[PDB]
Write a protein that holds these residues in place. Structure first.
Motif, PDB file in Angstrom:
ATOM      1  N   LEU A  66       0.826  -1.203   0.000  1.00  0.00           N
ATOM      2  CA  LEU A  66       0.000   0.000   0.000  1.00  0.00           C
ATOM      3  C   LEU A  66       0.863   1.257   0.000  1.00  0.00           C
ATOM      4  O   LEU A  66       0.389   2.347  -0.321  1.00  0.00           O
ATOM      5  N   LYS A  67       2.132   1.101   0.364  1.00  0.00           N
ATOM      6  CA  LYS A  67       3.082   2.204   0.298  1.00  0.00           C
ATOM      7  C   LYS A  67       3.529   2.429  -1.139  1.00  0.00           C
ATOM      8  O   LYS A  67       3.926   3.532  -1.513  1.00  0.00           O
ATOM      9  N   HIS A  68       3.458   1.373  -1.946  1.00  0.00           N
ATOM     10  CA  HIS A  68       3.779   1.471  -3.364  1.00  0.00           C
ATOM     11  C   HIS A  68       2.663   2.194  -4.111  1.00  0.00           C
ATOM     12  O   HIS A  68       2.872   2.717  -5.204  1.00  0.00           O
ATOM     13  N   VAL A  69       1.477   2.210  -3.511  1.00  0.00           N
ATOM     14  CA  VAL A  69       0.339   2.920  -4.081  1.00  0.00           C
ATOM     15  C   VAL A  69       0.592   4.422  -4.050  1.00  0.00           C
ATOM     16  O   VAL A  69       0.787   5.047  -5.093  1.00  0.00           O
ATOM     17  N   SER A  70       0.595   5.000  -2.852  1.00  0.00           N
ATOM     18  CA  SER A  70       0.914   6.413  -2.679  1.00  0.00           C
ATOM     19  C   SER A  70       2.380   6.661  -3.006  1.00  0.00           C
ATOM     20  O   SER A  70       3.189   6.923  -2.116  1.00  0.00           O
ATOM     21  N   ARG A  71       2.711   6.586  -4.292  1.00  0.00           N
ATOM     22  CA  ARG A  71       4.101   6.584  -4.725  1.00  0.00           C
ATOM     23  C   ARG A  71       4.210   6.756  -6.238  1.00  0.00           C
ATOM     24  O   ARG A  71       4.897   7.654  -6.723  1.00  0.00           O
ATOM     25  N   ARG A  72       3.510   5.897  -6.976  1.00  0.00           N
ATOM     26  CA  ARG A  72       3.639   5.836  -8.430  1.00  0.00           C
ATOM     27  C   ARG A  72       2.859   6.927  -9.164  1.00  0.00           C
ATOM     28  O   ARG A  72       3.449   7.768  -9.842  1.00  0.00           O
ATOM     29  N   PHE A  73       1.538   6.910  -9.026  1.00  0.00           N
ATOM     30  CA  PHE A  73       0.668   7.792  -9.807  1.00  0.00           C
ATOM     31  C   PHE A  73       0.648   9.226  -9.266  1.00  0.00           C
ATOM     32  O   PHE A  73      -0.257  10.001  -9.569  1.00  0.00           O
ATOM     33  N   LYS A  74       1.654   9.586  -8.477  1.00  0.00           N
ATOM     34  CA  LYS A  74       1.747  10.946  -7.966  1.00  0.00           C
ATOM     35  C   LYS A  74       2.167  11.902  -9.079  1.00  0.00           C
ATOM     36  O   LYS A  74       2.007  13.115  -8.967  1.00  0.00           O
ATOM     37  N   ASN A  75       2.695  11.339 -10.164  1.00  0.00           N
ATOM     38  CA  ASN A  75       3.114  12.133 -11.311  1.00  0.00           C
ATOM     39  C   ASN A  75       2.230  11.892 -12.535  1.00  0.00           C
ATOM     40  O   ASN A  75       1.710  12.838 -13.125  1.00  0.00           O
ATOM     41  N   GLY A  76       2.059  10.628 -12.910  1.00  0.00           N
ATOM     42  CA  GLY A  76       1.202  10.284 -14.032  1.00  0.00           C
ATOM     43  C   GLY A  76       1.573   8.992 -14.737  1.00  0.00           C
ATOM     44  O   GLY A  76       2.153   9.016 -15.823  1.00  0.00           O
ATOM     45  N   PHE A  77       1.223   7.867 -14.119  1.00  0.00           N
ATOM     46  CA  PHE A  77       1.483   6.537 -14.671  1.00  0.00           C
ATOM     47  C   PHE A  77       2.955   6.328 -15.015  1.00  0.00           C
ATOM     48  O   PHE A  77       3.283   5.834 -16.093  1.00  0.00           O
ATOM     49  N   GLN A  78       3.837   6.702 -14.094  1.00  0.00           N
ATOM     50  CA  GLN A  78       5.269   6.547 -14.312  1.00  0.00           C
ATOM     51  C   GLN A  78       5.693   5.084 -14.228  1.00  0.00           C
ATOM     52  O   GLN A  78       5.688   4.486 -13.153  1.00  0.00           O
TER      53      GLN A  78
END
Lengths: 87, 52, 50, 126, 119
Positions: A66-78
């Motif tokens: 769940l930490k990987h969640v609030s991590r990736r899409f903070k920019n845009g499908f990186q």
RNA sequence: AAACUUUCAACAACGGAUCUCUUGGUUCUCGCAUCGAUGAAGAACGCAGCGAAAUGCGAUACGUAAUGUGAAUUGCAGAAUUCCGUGAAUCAUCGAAUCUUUGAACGCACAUUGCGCCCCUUGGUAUUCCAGGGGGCAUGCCUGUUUGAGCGUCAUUU
RNA sequence: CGUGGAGGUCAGUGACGAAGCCUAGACCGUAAGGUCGGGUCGAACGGCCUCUAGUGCAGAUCUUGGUGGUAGUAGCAAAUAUUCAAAUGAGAACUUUGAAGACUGAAGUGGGGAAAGGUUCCACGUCAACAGCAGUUGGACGUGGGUUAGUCGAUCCUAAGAGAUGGGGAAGCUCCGUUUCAAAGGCCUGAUUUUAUGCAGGCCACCAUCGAAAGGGAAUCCGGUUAAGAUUCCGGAACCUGG
RNA sequence: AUAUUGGCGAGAGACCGAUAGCGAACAAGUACAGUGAUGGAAAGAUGAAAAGAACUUUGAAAAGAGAGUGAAAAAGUACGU
RNA sequence: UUGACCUCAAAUCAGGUAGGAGUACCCGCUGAACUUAAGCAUAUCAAUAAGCGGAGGAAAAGAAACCAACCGGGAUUGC
């Protein structure tokens, strides 16, 4: 009648240590659990009352993915890569 | 709050030995020496006039 | 006795390290207000029963 | 000024970036100024503190003495003094916890750590 | 001490193989001297070297897979990632609006002409 | 002229109000859509030089790699010279890996790290057993390649 | 009238010591009270004009925590018995060693297992709390070490019993039964060592699993050593099964 | 457009200020007890810097009575008052 | 004394799918008691509390076999 014991001659583990959780709440006889559902797909976790709910939810433990969640899409499908820019 | 004092509902003793109405919290010597919630008794204050 | 199993005994095998709390250094650390831990137990007279 | 978005106009909700502040920025909190001579030679007054630099004590309780920055504290927000050291119970070194902001810097060390970086950090170097 | 990380990415799979063995003997010699002396000279710099070697070797064995399997819709389930379920499903940038002869009249043939309401 | 008890203005025990405060917690708007078979959450079994109890992590186990910042942290120990710029950093950032026994968690189970088979490789100079490493296989629908019953119904040769 | 809190004002007071507590210190008022001084304490305080209502207090067997009189009190009676000497120590009726006098008389406080418990056993060190007198000893506390198996068990199998697929209800979450219309399982041989196997005869009714640490059951005893524990290691003497 | 007590990012405020507010500001679905589903604790506060107590006398140890340090030793591991 | 179409099956392959937690709000199906009561049933509480499954990232509903008797009306929900 009893003589004296009510909790006397006790030497047989009823509810054994649940391998699924570890709250010790399962027996071989009835083959049913009282913690989070054992052999079956059931999960003893309801929402009645104002308590006894959060211990089956999230936020109070690890959440390794769940930490990987609030991590990736903070920019845009990186899902690519990056390099240097300004030292 | 709709859950302030709405989290306790037990039953104590009656006649016989000296004991008042205190929801017998399980376990001997567990700190909760006869507590709970309810109204203006057990270790948990009450709020008159529920703020709508 | 001793005879039981592993999986059951495994879950009961961790309090051995609970026999060693504060040696001679944990008393003075970095902003530590809690000294000894209130989770000690010796079942010679203590009745935990899980 | 409360007008944009990221702005806390509350007293209690303004100390969040202190106890949980990033250690990479906690050092920036422990900065140090200059003097009335290097101001018209460097332009910028607020400069990062360095272990390879010296400093002089103006306040505290030791007037007329200089100290050297060695070990710095971030959890307690302080720094020990290498030069000015008191005596414990036998005579060794007492961890005098001070801060480079309350101390006046007299000497530095001109390297390439500045100059070119000053142009990046806004300035005009020497 | 502290080793590097760029010196391992410039070596082949054979050079890193013999280098790994050299780090294996380093372990047995950096665990004995502990029961005597309270601290070991180099006890920290031992779990940072081997951890970097296994990273480089494993990486070079995965980049070779993206060579011959490049240019197909049938690559092994190990080149992509976890991602999500929304991207693998839902609408697309073409299936959302199947361009044809009839649906063309909806957005393509008859879109929205610009205008300026004034005078 | 004493000790002791009740009412007892200072000092000195046990017991540890109230007031002055904080990194946090109950009623409500706006904005955003980032859970879900390349392996979720919780719990148990664990990990650092003195680590018993959280968090994080899962034999690369209080990290590695990349990016940004650009010259540390700690109560103590150990300490190489890359320290005037191929990357310190217990904080932060983190698109590509790994993640045992359990678990929506899969040959078949669990009071039991229970109990088998097939394929590939090495040794026991043995294609069949045993051991180690790696890789798999179970049920209820909807398509498809290579393949089997049943004189229910329907055809073609001397 | 007082306390807490918000807004405005005397652009007040504030290390020349705020506020709170005590005061056998004083003044004013019929009653609710405030101000001053001293001691203690060392950080933001008070009045008036308004607003807000979870502000004031002897009792609801009121709730929680703490403290007396009683009181240096009752109790300290199941189970025959203490005393002397030596070592250690500031300190001993009681722990250690030796001797004398005794209790229990293998149906005992013995010596071996299962269940519960998983570091309460062994070694060393210590006496501030607990150990309701004492106690250098200890089942209190801190620092370590021991865990070795083809063979006695367990795992495997079976009765009791629990529980699937293929059927049969219900909106969902499921239950009962254990073979109650089978297309359930794929082997010996022939044609094939080097085909990891495609077509025809002749056979077998067994065809999810789990399920006893007193029963069921092909196999190892004795002796010695250590601070502790073996049928496991060492030494000597043997047997069975599979490939 | 409209809804929006759980997740993420500011003010979420004319609240309360440790027997109060949700059960939790701390080890907080805590500690203890129980065969299970549960109920659910008590304890917020040093100073600029632990300098956390040099040395000497009595004592077996833990202390008291001096001295030193500190603005105040009327803050002494029973923590501001 | 001999080959096709339809229906009904059987794997470990390329290419796919299934079994749930949290769950504000919302939707479909099934289904109680207590309070009030000029006594009791009907009725109110209540197309409810609690519990379960599926879908979505707002859901349900909604671009007319609808709403009117007027100056004909111009999609849904909510204040």
């Amino acid at each position: 009648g009893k003589g004296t014991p009510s909790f006397g001659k006790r030497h047989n583990k009823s509810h054994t240590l649940c391998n699924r959780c570890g709250r010790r709440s399962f027996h071989v006889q009835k083959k049913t659990c009282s913690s989070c559902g054992y052999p079956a797909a059931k999960t003893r976790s309801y929402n009645w009352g104002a308590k006894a709910k959060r211990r089956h939810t999230t936020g109070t433990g690890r959440m390794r993915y769940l930490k990987h969640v609030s991590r990736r899409f903070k920019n845009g499908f990186q899902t690519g890569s990056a390099s240097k820019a300004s030292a | 709050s709709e859950k302030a004092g709405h989290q306790t509902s037990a039953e104590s003793w009656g006649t016989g030995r000296a004991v008042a109405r205190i929801p017998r919290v399980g376990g001997g010597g567990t700190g909760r020496s006869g507590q709970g919630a309810f109204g203006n008794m057990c270790r948990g204050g009450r709020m008159f006039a529920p703020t709508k | 006795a001793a005879q039981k199993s592993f999986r059951i005994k495994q879950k009961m095998a961790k309090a051995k390290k609970q026999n060693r709390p504060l040696p001679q250094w944990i008393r003075l650390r970095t902003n530590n207000t809690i000294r000894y831990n209130a989770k000690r137990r010796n079942w010679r007279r203590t009745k935990m029963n899980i | 000024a409360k007008q944009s978005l990221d702005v806390s106009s509350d007293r209690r909700k303004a100390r969040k970036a202190y106890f949980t502040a990033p250690s990479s920025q906690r050092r920036v909190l422990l900065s140090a100024p200059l003097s009335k001579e290097l101001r018209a030679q460097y332009g910028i007054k607020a400069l990062p503190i360095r272990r390879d630099d010296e400093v002089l004590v103006v306040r505290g309780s030791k007037k007329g003495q200089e100290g050297k920055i060695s070990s710095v504290y971030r959890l307690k927000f302080a720094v020990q003094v290498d030069k000015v050291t008191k005596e414990k119970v036998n005579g060794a070194s007492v961890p005098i916890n001070l801060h480079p902001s309350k101390l006046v810097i007299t000497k530095l060390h001109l390297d390439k750590d500045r100059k070119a970086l000053i142009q990046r950090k806004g300035g005009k170097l020497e | 001490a502290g080793v590097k990380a760029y010196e391992l990415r410039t070596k082949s799979k054979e050079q890193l193989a013999s280098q790994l063995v050299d780090l294996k003997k380093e372990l047995a010699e950096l665990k004995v001297q502990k029961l005597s002396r309270p601290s070991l000279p180099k006890i920290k710099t031992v779990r940072k070297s081997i951890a970097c070697v296994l990273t480089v070797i494993n990486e070079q064995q995965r980049e070779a897979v993206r060579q011959l399997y490049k240019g197909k819709k049938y690559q092994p389930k190990d080149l992509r990632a976890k991602k999500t379920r929304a991207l693998r499903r839902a609408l697309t940038k073409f299936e959302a609006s199947q361009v044809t002869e009839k649906q063309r009249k909806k957005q393509i043939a008859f879109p929205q002409r610009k205008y300026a309401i004034k005078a």
